[model samples]
Target: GVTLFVALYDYEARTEDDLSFHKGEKFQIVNNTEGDWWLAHSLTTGETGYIPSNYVAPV
Candidate 1:
């Protein structure tokens, strides 16, 4: 099963491996086993990458 999260604030991809999203955007959490960051795939863009865990809230 996939975990969903809602973007708490806008975040821009600072590197080639990070995913970007706007506030209120909902996306799928690919993995959150790592510390500080989580792997996420945007529901709107279908793109995947690492994002700061604090940037989103579990939904």
Candidate 2:
């Protein structure tokens, strides 16, 4: 399990494992797997896709 994060920048989706978000938008961190990547959700859209763990931080 994970948590939500407020984006500080915009990111574009490049693959099924990637996602896009804008600053001030909401995203969900669904899994807590330890690695550079983790499963997530995009409140702005549907469960967009996974995101780089390093791309976001806990708020």
Candidate 3:
């Protein structure tokens, strides 16, 4: 089965224009904009933004 992880914040890129993450939340990757990067849509709030893969974990 395929599993998906979610973002806890509107996490920003370490060196690019990205949205920062919020605590105790999750998001789904709609698109990946850069290396190991993804544009995610919030699962809980429906907010969309860019997030780094390194900061995300399987849940």
RMSD to truth, every model = 1.3, 2.4, 3.8
List residue ranges in candidate 1 displaced over 4 A.
Answer: none
lDDT by residue (tens digit), candidate 3, 4-51: 565545554465356566655676677765668777776776666677
The 0-to-1 C-alpha lDDT of every candidate, in the order given, reads: 0.85, 0.72, 0.65
Q: Candidates sorted by TM-score, descending order?
A: 1, 2, 3
lDDT of 1 by residue, 1-59 (tens): 75689999998888969987899888888788877788888887788888899888888
Q: For candidate 2, lDDT tens digit of each residue in 1-59?
A: 65577677777878766777777677777775766677778777776677766667666
Supply candidate 2's per-residue lDDT for 1. 62
TM-score of 2: 0.68
Candidate 2: misplaced stretches above 4 Å?
A: none
The order of the candidates by lDDT, greatest first, is 1, 2, 3
The TM-score leader among the candidates is 1
Error of 2 at 40 (Å): 0.4
Candidate 3: 10-residue stretch with minimal lDDT = 8-17
